[PDB]
Curated annotation (Swiss-Prot):
Similarity comment text for this entry: Belongs to the sigma-70 factor family. RpoD/SigA subfamily.
Residue span relative to the full protein: 457 to 535 of 613
Disulfide bonds: none
Region (Sigma-70 factor domain-3) residue spans: 2-78
Protein name from the UniProt record: RNA polymerase sigma factor RpoD
Superkingdom of the organism of origin: Bacteria
Organism taxonomic ancestry: Bacteria, Pseudomonadati, Pseudomonadota, Gammaproteobacteria, Enterobacterales
Organism of this sequence: Escherichia coli (strain K12)
Length: 79
DNA sequence: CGCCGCGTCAGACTCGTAGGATTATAGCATACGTGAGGTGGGATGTCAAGGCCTTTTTTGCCTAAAATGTGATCTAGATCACATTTTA
């Protein structure tokens, strides 16, 4: 959490300075820690996106309908 | 008794189209456990030569014994130009 705070606060100032966003190269430099941890945390920062959202813009497809289950078996494999 | 206000509750059906989110939240110190790493060590699994038995491959061998050789003495087939001679 603390690492994320420092990141997203510094990215604003880097946005002022550059006029653009920072890269994990430039930001791993500014963040004092190597690119592995940066990239890692960037991979961690994502949330879930709520199956009951309407990916059909019309009330046709709540996202859960789209989802496949690849867990059970296929009858051809059984045979 | 008979309004009136407020609130509850349905609004056809099968296909297709697209990807998709966002704000800001302090900071460092203590101390404890769990994940990724070492590490000898039973124990399991493998691979190359040897002793029990039967079968198989050579291989003795065992005697019936029928077969393989000895060669001078024959024999019953086999020929060819001429002289007819028969048959369709």
């Amino acid at each position: 959490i603390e690492t994320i705070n420092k990141l997203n606060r510094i990215s604003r100032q880097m946005l002022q300075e550059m006029g653009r966003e920072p890269t994990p190269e430039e930001l791993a430099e500014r963040m004092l820690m190597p690119e592995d941890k940066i990239r890692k945390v960037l991979k961690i920062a994502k949330e879930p996106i709520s199956m009951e959202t309407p990916i059909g813009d019309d009330e046709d497809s709540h996202l859960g309908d789209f989802i496949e289950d690849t867990t059970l078996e296929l009858p051809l494999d059984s045979a």
